[PDB]
Amino acid sequence: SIVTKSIVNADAEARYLSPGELDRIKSFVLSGQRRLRIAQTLTENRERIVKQGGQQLFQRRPDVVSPGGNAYGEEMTATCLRDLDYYLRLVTYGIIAGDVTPIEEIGLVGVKEMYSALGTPISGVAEGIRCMKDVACSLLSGEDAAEVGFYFDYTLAAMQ
Amino acid sequence: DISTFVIGNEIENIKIQFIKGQISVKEMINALGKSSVYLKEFYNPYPNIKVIELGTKHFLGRAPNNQAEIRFYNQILASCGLQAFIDMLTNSQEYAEIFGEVRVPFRRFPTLPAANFPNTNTLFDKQTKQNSVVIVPSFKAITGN
Amino acid sequence: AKFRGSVLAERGAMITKAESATASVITSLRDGLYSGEAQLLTASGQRL
Amino acid sequence: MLDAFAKVVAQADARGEFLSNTQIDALSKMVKEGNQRLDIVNKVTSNASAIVTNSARALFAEQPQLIQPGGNAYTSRRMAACLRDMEIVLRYVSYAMIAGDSSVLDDRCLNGLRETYQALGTPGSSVAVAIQKMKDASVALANDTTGTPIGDCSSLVAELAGYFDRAAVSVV
Amino acid sequence: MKSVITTVVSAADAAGRFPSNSDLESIQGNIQRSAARLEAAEKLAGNHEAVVKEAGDACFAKYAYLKNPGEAGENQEKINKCYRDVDHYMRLVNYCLVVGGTGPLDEWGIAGAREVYRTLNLPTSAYVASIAYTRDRLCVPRDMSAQAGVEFSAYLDYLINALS
Amino acid sequence: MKSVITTVVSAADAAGRFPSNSDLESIQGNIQRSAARLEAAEKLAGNHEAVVKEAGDACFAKYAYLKNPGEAGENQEKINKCYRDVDHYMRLVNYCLVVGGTGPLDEWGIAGAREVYRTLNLPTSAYVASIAYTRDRLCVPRDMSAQAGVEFSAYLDYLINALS
Amino acid sequence: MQDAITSVINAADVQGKYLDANSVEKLRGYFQTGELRVRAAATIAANAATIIKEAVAKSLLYSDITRPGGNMYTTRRYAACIRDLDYYLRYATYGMLAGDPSILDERVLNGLKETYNSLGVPIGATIQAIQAMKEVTGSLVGSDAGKEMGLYFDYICSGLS
Amino acid sequence: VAAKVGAFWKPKAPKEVPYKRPMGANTPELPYNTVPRLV
Amino acid sequence: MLDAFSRVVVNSDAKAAYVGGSDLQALKSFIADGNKRLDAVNSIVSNASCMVSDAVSGMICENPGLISPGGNCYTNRRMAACLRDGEIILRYVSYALLAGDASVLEDRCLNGLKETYIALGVPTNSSIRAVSIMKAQAVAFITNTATERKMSFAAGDCTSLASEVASYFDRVGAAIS
Amino acid sequence: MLDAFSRVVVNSDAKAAYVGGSDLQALKSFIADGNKRLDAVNSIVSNASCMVSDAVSGMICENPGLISPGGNCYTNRRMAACLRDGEIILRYVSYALLAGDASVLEDRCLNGLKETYIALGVPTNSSIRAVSIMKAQAVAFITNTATERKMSFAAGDCTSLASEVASYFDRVGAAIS
Ligand SMILES: *C(C)[C@H]1/C(=C/C2=NC(=C\c3[nH]c(C[C@H]4NC(=O)C(C=C)=C4C)c(C)c3CCC(=O)O)/C(CCC(=O)O)=C2C)NC(=O)[C@@H]1C
Ligand SMILES: *[C@@H](C)[C@H]1/C(=C/C2=NC(=C\c3[nH]c(C[C@H]4NC(=O)C(C=C)=C4C)c(C)c3CCC(=O)O)/C(CCC(=O)O)=C2C)NC(=O)[C@@H]1C
Ligand SMILES: *[C@@H](C)[C@H]1/C(=C/C2=NC(=C\c3[nH]c(C[C@H]4NC(=O)C(C=C)=C4C)c(C)c3CCC(=O)O)/C(CCC(=O)O)=C2C)NC(=O)[C@@H]1C
Ligand SMILES: *[C@@H](C)[C@H]1/C(=C/C2=NC(=C\c3[nH]c(C[C@H]4NC(=O)C(C=C)=C4C)c(C)c3CCC(=O)O)/C(CCC(=O)O)=C2C)NC(=O)[C@@H]1C
Ligand SMILES: *[C@H](C)[C@H]1/C(=C/C2=NC(=C\c3[nH]c(C[C@H]4NC(=O)C(C=C)=C4C)c(C)c3CCC(=O)O)/C(CCC(=O)O)=C2C)NC(=O)[C@@H]1C
Numbered sequence A: 001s002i003v004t005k006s007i008v009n010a011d012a013e014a015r016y017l018s019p020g021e022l023d024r025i026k027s028f029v030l031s032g033q034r035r036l037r038i039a040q041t042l043t044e045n046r047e048r049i050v051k052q053g054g055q056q057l058f059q060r061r062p063d064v065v066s067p068g069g070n071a072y073g074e075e076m077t078a079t080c081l082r083d084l085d086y087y088l089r090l091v092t093y094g095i096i097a098g099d100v101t102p103i104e105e106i107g108l109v110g111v112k113e114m115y116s117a118l119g120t121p122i123s124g125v126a127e128g129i130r131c132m133k134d135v136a137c138s139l140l141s142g143e144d145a146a147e148v149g150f151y152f153d154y155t156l157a158a159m160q
Numbered sequence B: 001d002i003s004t005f006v007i008g009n010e011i012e013n014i015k016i017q018f019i020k021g022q023i024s025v026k027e028m029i030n031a032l033g034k035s036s037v038y039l040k041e042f043y044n045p046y047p048n049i050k051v052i053e054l055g056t057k058h059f060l061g062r063a064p065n066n067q068a069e070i071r072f073y074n075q076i077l078a079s080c081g082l083q084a085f086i087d088m089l090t091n092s093q094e095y096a097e098i099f100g101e102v103r104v105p106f107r108r109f110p111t112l113p114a115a116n117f118p119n120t121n122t123l124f125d126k127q128t129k130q131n132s133v134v135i136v137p138s139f140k141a142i143t144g145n
Numbered sequence C: 001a002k003f004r005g006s007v008l009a010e011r012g013a014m015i016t017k018a019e020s021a022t023a024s025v026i027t028s029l030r031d032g033l034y035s036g037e038a039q040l041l042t043a044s045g046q047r048l
Numbered sequence D: 001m002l003d004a005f006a007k008v009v010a011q012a013d014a015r016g017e018f019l020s021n022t023q024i025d026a027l028s029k030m031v032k033e034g035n036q037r038l039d040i041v042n043k044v045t046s047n048a049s050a051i052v053t054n055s056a057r058a059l060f061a062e063q064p065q066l067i068q069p070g071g072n073a074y075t076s077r078r079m080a081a082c083l084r085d086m087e088i089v090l091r092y093v094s095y096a097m098i099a100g101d102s103s104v105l106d107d108r109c110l111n112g113l114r115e116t117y118q119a120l121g122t123p124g125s126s127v128a129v130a131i132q133k134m135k136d137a138s139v140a141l142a143n144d145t146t147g148t149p150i151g152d153c154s155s156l157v158a159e160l161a162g163y164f165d166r167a168a169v170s171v172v
Numbered sequence E, F: 001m002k003s004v005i006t007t008v009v010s011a012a013d014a015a016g017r018f019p020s021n022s023d024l025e026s027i028q029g030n031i032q033r034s035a036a037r038l039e040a041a042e043k044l045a046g047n048h049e050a051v052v053k054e055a056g057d058a059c060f061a062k063y064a065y066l067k068n069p070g071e072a073g074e075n076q077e078k079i080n081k082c083y084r085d086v087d088h089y090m091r092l093v094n095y096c097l098v099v100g101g102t103g104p105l106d107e108w109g110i111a112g113a114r115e116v117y118r119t120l121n122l123p124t125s126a127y128v129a130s131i132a133y134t135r136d137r138l139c140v141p142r143d144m145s146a147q148a149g150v151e152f153s154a155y156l157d158y159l160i161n162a163l164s
Numbered sequence G: 001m002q003d004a005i006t007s008v009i010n011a012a013d014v015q016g017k018y019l020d021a022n023s024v025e026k027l028r029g030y031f032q033t034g035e036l037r038v039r040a041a042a043t044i045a046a047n048a049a050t051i052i053k054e055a056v057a058k059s060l061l062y063s064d065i066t067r068p069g070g071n072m073y074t075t076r077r078y079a080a081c082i083r084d085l086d087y088y089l090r091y092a093t094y095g096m097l098a099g100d101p102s103i104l105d106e107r108v109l110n111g112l113k114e115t116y117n118s119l120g121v122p123i124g125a126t127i128q129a130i131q132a133m134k135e136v137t138g139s140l141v142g143s144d145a146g147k148e149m150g151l152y153f154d155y156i157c158s159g160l161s
Numbered sequence H: 001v002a003a004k005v006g007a008f009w010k011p012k013a014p015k016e017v018p019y020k021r022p023m024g025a026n027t028p029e030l031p032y033n034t035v036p037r038l039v
Numbered sequence I, J: 001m002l003d004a005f006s007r008v009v010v011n012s013d014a015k016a017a018y019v020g021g022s023d024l025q026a027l028k029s030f031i032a033d034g035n036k037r038l039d040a041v042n043s044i045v046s047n048a049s050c051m052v053s054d055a056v057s058g059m060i061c062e063n064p065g066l067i068s069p070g071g072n073c074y075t076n077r078r079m080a081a082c083l084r085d086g087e088i089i090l091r092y093v094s095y096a097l098l099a100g101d102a103s104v105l106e107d108r109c110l111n112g113l114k115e116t117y118i119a120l121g122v123p124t125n126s127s128i129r130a131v132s133i134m135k136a137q138a139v140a141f142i143t144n145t146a147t148e149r150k151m152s153f154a155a156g157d158c159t160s161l162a163s164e165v166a167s168y169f170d171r172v173g174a175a176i177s
């Protein structure tokens, strides 16, 4: 949350929120009705984003679903697509919070040591996040897509 | 080890800067304790009274000595914050005597102060997040000023 | 519009920092780091 | 014995996987190098009598105790055995150049050779000097133009020099 | 091509006179500033591949509209030309620290640049976001000397003034 | 090899200079020292089979258990390889009095020699009992000059302290 | 610490669901009052020293607490007590912006009743100084903001008893 | 995916300028009639 | 037009390369032996009107076919225009000594001079002798071995400046011919 | 590198022989003629500044295309790197005369010099001219037949010191050639 992240920056320096930090929190709450409409555009398009984003992934990385890959089998490919739904849900949390804090604490902290324990290619999960960003950003306008595009951009770099 | 509570890029430049021999063990420890990883781990969830007992534990290997020390660090954490706290520990004369610029701090079983032995043993014998108790909240007031 | 204008420099700078770490872990892996006998003797250095 | 193409197949069978799409594309660069890798093997095979003899003659000029009586390369039978060890190591380096993988070199030639020269008394620090002299005679002959079209063969003679360095630290 | 040297040997060539005592007194100041500006050139020559990476994506962090279809960097080989355009300007700033004047940036970077970037639809507001990021990330004890960062950041806002 | 002229020229090249006039003094001081140093080496080369024969059997007089069966002087061929080895060390000292340094003794006769004699079960005390006999058989009249015997007895001292 | 936004996202995330229509109304209730909190938080940061000055004069100044034998008698003991009122005013302003008292349970109230028992600081007089800060603050920020700020002044007083 | 190592925005230089050059005062001083590292 | 620092950056521009620590060290020695360059320009420009009156009248005493009618330095008008022709050449050499290369000498003084003297009928071999006496005059003043005037310097070796000024005077002779 | 003393050691170790007899006699000649040799090294390092610059600027006035644009000594960055090469070559021929053996010249200076002078494109026939110019100066400063400067020496025949330093200079010539 933009509010929580600005308080821990002030509490660390033992001070009050500066007028520049308070001015950012003001336009964060006033733009809440517009940011709630961007998160609901993705919430009503899960079937298209997770199905298309997962179909595009298996064409750029066919070896993860081929016999011998991590996501091989009916139940294993389903868990594969289950994870793209976990990360699309967190991106809607971050659009509403105004910060990458919900994505970081749920599904980015300890994610590399996690996937390495299951034997999952971390670069195959970043490829599926880049393919969901292609579907999701095509549902939005010029602005309101750069906003959605950032939370997909951070999840890529932070995951690698 | 940081693998379970970091994303992976918070203290990556401090590591590369140390392996090149550019910074000493004392600079790598000051730069490591005043990072976003330490602030998120040992400053946000706890009050300043518990942040003092953890700061001496990690950077000095011992619990707080006496009341004059608790009220000295408490005034730093009220005015200047966390990063001025870490500088007062690493730049102290006690640090330079026992750890210098080439050693990493250790558990440091103490003897001489009145309760520093049993207090330092309660800090280092408890596991991380074992409970939310403050070991040395303060010293019971001795008569006088 | 005012909200984005205040966070644009914060956001692009935190993405550059995350990619400088990936580039460093890749040149460090090829440079022989993490191949030591003390790294392969841990369980998390075997996953890496 | 497996080449560069069968090396990535053997690494993927131990994981039980199909080849990745960047692994097919990196094998398509080796096919594109191709005609040039065959120029390097053609240039050190057509001069293989002169790589060995010019770098044998240069070895007994700096180390004259090797051909003194009692030295290791002193007799007709021990001199002819030094000249064919140089011709064998040059043979398996050119096999490893055409394969793209040092697996024919260190299974057929380099494995067990350090412990063999110690059983015979052969100074392995002097075999390494004779290998490093064949390296300079080969890389000076790999990058001359002389009937080939002009281009960049620099990462292929850096691989040829790497096989000679591997054989020279494995004899001692 | 614009130096301490070339402005005093073409002023006395235009008057038709010899090198005078005021001409040699300008070449004395070329000796004195050379310790500070060649230090800034040597730090830039060893670190240029990381300072055009972090300043090239200060353009695209600020201007996300440039990656739309029909825009300036819309495929990957136009984004690589953008970092190449930044790396051309950092090479020319490094030449000005060596020469001792804005000669290589005037002739090879600035002359003709308004006509090119208007014809080719390249916004110069995104070129100056790349150069003002580099001027604002300078740290005069950390990155170079005190006076090495005075004239590293003087050729950087010579580009900012001539592209705006 | 560190030598007479060589060790000055190699130090006048690490500084990159020409031969100094204070670099021609230590050359002349090393040429005048080598006059007596060559007189020792001419004596040892002109009469070596006599000085080896009487230094070899001083080892077997002191260590008469080496001629026992099972030991390092058991055959006659193992005896002849003992007098060969004393003649090898007297030859390397002759090379050290010409070079004017302990270079030939280090590379060609000391490096790895201690590890050879352990694997072959030869006592290093028996190699030094034949060089110690040669050191004090020297007489400053009737053998060489009193200055030549100082250089000759220092390289025999370097070899004694290297084997033992 | 977690604010009203964090607590609404948590109730949905602990089921694995997206934000439904009930979650969006709880989020609109926060965004509506968010401009009144930013305005009270800016006026408290400017009069932070005047609020504590006016609040001590009303409660602690001329009593047994400051006379010889009181807890705030000596000068070190007077400065140490107004440094505590800076803690309470600064952290109650964090909790008002966030709309959650979660930062008071962690950063303020943990181990605080045990610190005051060791030193001998009076609890009944501490609560009366925080209640004087609630009046002085509610006069600067009005009734709407003053009734929200007093919700966290009361949280400290109830956890301190 | 999307790794940016080095100067990714331009193809590297050929680097094919390998030639010998006398190392005045940098030539390694070797032993004569021998090889290094003891025997 | 160019100097020695911008001659370096047009060589690095041909390779699209940054000028760094290899060929910065050749420029740090240019700055360090830089007061030697400024004393050497100052000694040329202080003896310049004796130096041009002696090289032109030295050219007359070598070849006295220029004082007979039909000569090219015959008239009183042509002697002034030859004594002005030889101090343009000294002026552009001392620009090239002060700068560090001979690209002010190529562009502004030696462009079209060969085509001018052919169309004027100015004899070429008498002119090379006029700049060769100026070459021997220049290396005498800046190594301080002049027989009629000695100037006060600090002590040291300036023979590489005097081998640079003779390459500038040989550039004038090669383009006239 | 080897001097005259190291070389008889490495030539007799290669035979397992003692140093004495005909090989020790040639070492007495080095000791006897020791003062005489050190003047021949002294009569080079005192003129080593103007032995170089007379040679580099001497080959320019015989082949003046080297300063024309396109020539190899055109820019001041190319002319300064040629003056540095004539001093490096003369620094090792002085080292090889002082040591009495050509091995410091053959290893540190001429090893891989012919392969470097073609990759840069230095003209070979122009480079061996300046060596031949420097060769004539060295055999003149040693025999004391230098016509612009004499030296105060003792009386005696320094033949075969000049013939030995003649044999080093054409060894520099036959390397790059
Ligand atoms: C050939 C190069 C010359 C020539 C040489 C002679 N020099 C003679 C004697 C001599 N030389 C020096 C200087 C030299 N000795 C040093 O110790 C040092 C520096 C450390 C140097 C430069 C000295 C001091 C002497 C001794 C003077 C004396 O006592 O008389 C010399 C005569 C002795 C001999 O032949 O060995 C000769 C012939 N003389 C020549 O005619 C040519 C041109
Ligand atoms: C100093 C008063 C500043 C400060 C800044 C920090 N900079 C950090 C990294 C950094 N800085 C630059 C630009 C700089 N490097 C160069 O090589 C040149 C010019 C030749 C310049 C102007 C770059 C490109 C980077 C990233 C790579 C690197 O670390 O070298 C930095 C490290 C944290 C980070 O990665 O962002 C800091 C803290 N230091 C200070 O204390 C103030 C804020
Ligand atoms: C001086 C009065 C001495 C002394 C001298 C004697 N030496 C006798 C025989 C002898 N000497 C050598 C010298 C040898 N040691 C060396 O270091 C060198 C040169 C490097 C040499 C040549 C040898 C080989 C011999 C044996 C010859 C032989 O046995 O025939 C000697 C006896 C004469 C003789 O036996 O012919 C004497 C008196 N002896 C002394 O007591 C003082 C200290
Ligand atoms: C003016 C007097 C200067 C000066 C000039 C120098 N002139 C130098 C050499 C030189 N001068 C002449 C002309 C002169 N010689 C003649 O035979 C005749 C008449 C027929 C005249 C007028 C010639 C021919 C030369 C030599 C040319 C050459 O060597 O190639 C000269 C260099 C030698 C020296 O240092 O003396 C200088 C410096 N000298 C002065 O000090 C005042 C200031
Ligand atoms: C690299 C070490 C050489 C060099 C090599 C090049 N060869 C090029 C093309 C080429 N090579 C062949 C022959 C192929 N068939 C064979 O039988 C053998 C072995 C005997 C070989 C290598 C052919 C037929 C061709 C032309 C076919 C084609 O190009 O499609 C080549 C590319 C040409 C260019 O880049 O211009 C290179 C670089 N060239 C060198 O300069 C070094 C010394």
Ligand SMILES: *[C@H](C)[C@H]1/C(=C/C2=NC(=C\c3[nH]c(C[C@H]4NC(=O)C(C=C)=C4C)c(C)c3CCC(=O)O)/C(CCC(=O)O)=C2C)NC(=O)[C@@H]1C
Pocket (backbone or CB within 6 Å): I056, I072, I073, I078, I079, I081, I082, I083, I085, I086, I088, I089, I108, I109, I113, I116, I120, I122, I123, I126, I127, I130
């Ligand atoms: C004297 C030592 C020579 C000689 C010289 C003459 N030059 C004459 C005319 C002339 N010279 C130039 C070139 C000069 N002017 C410049 O502006 C520049 C550089 C930018 C240079 C190098 C020009 C253009 C002209 C024509 C203009 C004019 O006529 O004044 C000249 C006059 C010829 C005549 O009318 O008789 C003379 C005598 N001639 C000689 O014989 C010696 C070698």
Ligand SMILES: *[C@H](C)[C@H]1/C(=C/C2=NC(=C\c3[nH]c(C[C@H]4NC(=O)C(C=C)=C4C)c(C)c3CCC(=O)O)/C(CCC(=O)O)=C2C)NC(=O)[C@@H]1C
Pocket (backbone or CB within 6 Å): E021, E024, E025, E028, I032, I033, I034, I035, I036, I037, I038, I039, I040, I042, I142, I143, I144, I153, I154, I155, I156, I157, I158, I161
């Ligand atoms: C070579 C042509 C000369 C010679 C030159 C040396 N000059 C040295 C020091 C030096 N020179 C100057 C003169 C010059 N510098 C200026 O700024 C101006 C006018 C504006 C002029 C005319 C100065 C001021 C200095 C002082 C620098 C210092 O000493 O710190 C010098 C010493 C070595 C060096 O610093 O380069 C030399 C060798 N000396 C000669 O004998 C020939 C003739």
Ligand SMILES: *[C@H](C)[C@H]1/C(=C/c2[nH]c(/C=C3N=C(/C=C4\NC(=O)C(CC)=C4C)C(C)=C\3CCC(=O)O)c(CCC(=O)O)c2C)NC(=O)[C@@H]1C
Pocket (backbone or CB within 6 Å): D066, D072, D073, D077, D078, D079, D081, D082, D083, D085, D086, D088, D089, D108, D109, D110, D113, D120, D122, D123, D126, D127, D130
């Ligand atoms: C020559 C440069 C150096 C040298 C060589 C030397 N080698 C031998 C003897 C043998 N060498 C081998 C070598 C190989 N056998 C293999 O199968 C392979 C591929 C794996 C190699 C490289 C073998 C088996 C022998 C013994 C059999 C034989 O008769 O050759 C000798 C002769 C030793 C002897 O006669 O006792 C010599 C001299 N020695 C040198 O001094 C050079 C440095």
Ligand SMILES: C=CC1=C(C)[C@@H](Cc2[nH]c(/C=C3N=C(/C=C4\NC(=O)[C@H](C)[C@H]4CC)C(C)=C\3CCC(=O)O)c(CCC(=O)O)c2C)NC1=O
Pocket (backbone or CB within 6 Å): E056, E059, E066, E072, E073, E078, E079, E081, E082, E083, E085, E086, E088, E089, E108, E109, E116, E120, E122, E123, E126, E127, E130
């Ligand atoms: C020696 C000095 C020197 C320079 C400074 C550059 C200047 C320069 N840049 C470009 C060319 C370009 N420059 C950019 C740069 C940008 N576009 C963006 O998205 C951002 C606005 C911005 C930097 C972040 C792009 C995309 C092109 C290619 C334009 C095109 O192909 O249409 C061109 C056109 C020629 C070509 O297409 O190759 C030129 C002359 N070139 C030089 O030779």
Ligand SMILES: C=CC1=C(C)[C@@H](Cc2[nH]c(/C=C3N=C(/C=C4\NC(=O)[C@H](C)[C@H]4CC)C(C)=C\3CCC(=O)O)c(CCC(=O)O)c2C)NC1=O
Pocket (backbone or CB within 6 Å): H021, H022, H023, H024, H025, J056, J066, J072, J073, J078, J079, J081, J082, J083, J085, J086, J088, J089, J108, J109, J110, J113, J116, J120, J122, J123, J126, J127, J130
């Ligand atoms: C220890 C032994 C040793 C040497 C002998 C020299 C040899 C040498 N010279 C040059 C380099 C050079 N050498 C010359 C010299 C000449 N070119 C000519 O036209 C003339 C014929 C000739 C001198 C009169 C020039 C002009 C260059 C520079 C070439 C260039 O930069 O393009 C280089 C390349 C290094 C560099 O460019 O900085 C080397 C190794 N250097 C050494 O370290």
Ligand SMILES: C=CC1=C(C)[C@@H](Cc2[nH]c(/C=C3N=C(/C=C4\NC(=O)[C@H](C)[C@H]4CC)C(C)=C\3CCC(=O)O)c(CCC(=O)O)c2C)NC1=O
Pocket (backbone or CB within 6 Å): J047, J049, J050, J051, J054, J055, J057, J058, J059, J060, J061, J062, J133, J136, J137, J140, J141, J145, J146, J147, J148, J149
């Ligand atoms: C066009 C330009 C041009 C030059 C610059 C000169 C350059 C030059 N000088 C010499 C030849 C020489 N150069 C010198 C050098 C010197 N003499 C001294 O007394 C000084 C101390 C020192 C200069 C500092 C010596 C000693 C000789 C040998 C002949 C002589 O004694 O002069 C030679 C070779 C002559 C030969 O032996 O065949 C050449 C070409 N000649 C030219 O044609």
Ligand SMILES: CCC1=C(C)/C(=C/C2=NC(=C\c3[nH]c(/C=C4\NC(=O)[C@H](C)[C@H]4CC)c(C)c3CCC(=O)O)/C(CCC(=O)O)=C2C)NC1=O
Pocket (backbone or CB within 6 Å): G057, G061, G062, G063, G066, G067, G072, G073, G074, G075, G078
């Ligand atoms: C034993 C050490 C000690 C000291 C010194 C001390 C001071 C002290 N001074 C006070 C007030 C005060 N002190 C002053 C003092 C002054 N006004 C002036 O103009 C003068 C410059 C200055 C006196 C020389 C005033 C006016 C007040 C009342 C302020 C108010 O109520 O607003 C108060 C609050 C009311 C009270 O008296 O209880 C304390 C506690 N307490 C201590 O324990």
Ligand SMILES: CCC1=C(C)/C(=C/C2=NC(=C\c3[nH]c(/C=C4\NC(=O)[C@H](C)[C@H]4CC)c(C)c3CCC(=O)O)/C(CCC(=O)O)=C2C)NC1=O
Pocket (backbone or CB within 6 Å): B047, B048, B049, B050, B070, B071, B074, B075, B138, B141, G065, G071, G072, G076, G077, G078, G080, G081, G082, G084, G085, G087, G107, G108, G109, G112, G115, G119, G121, G122, G125, G126, G129
């Ligand atoms: C961030 C949360 C937090 C708090 C609140 C905190 C309080 C705290 N209050 C302290 C003391 C004190 N606190 C007081 C307070 C008071 N005296 C009165 O009469 C009043 C009733 C009351 C103020 C309203 C006094 C007088 C002392 C000093 C006791 C002494 O010196 O013996 C001390 C001991 C250190 C010192 O003396 O400075 C701590 C650690 N620490 C924390 O981390």
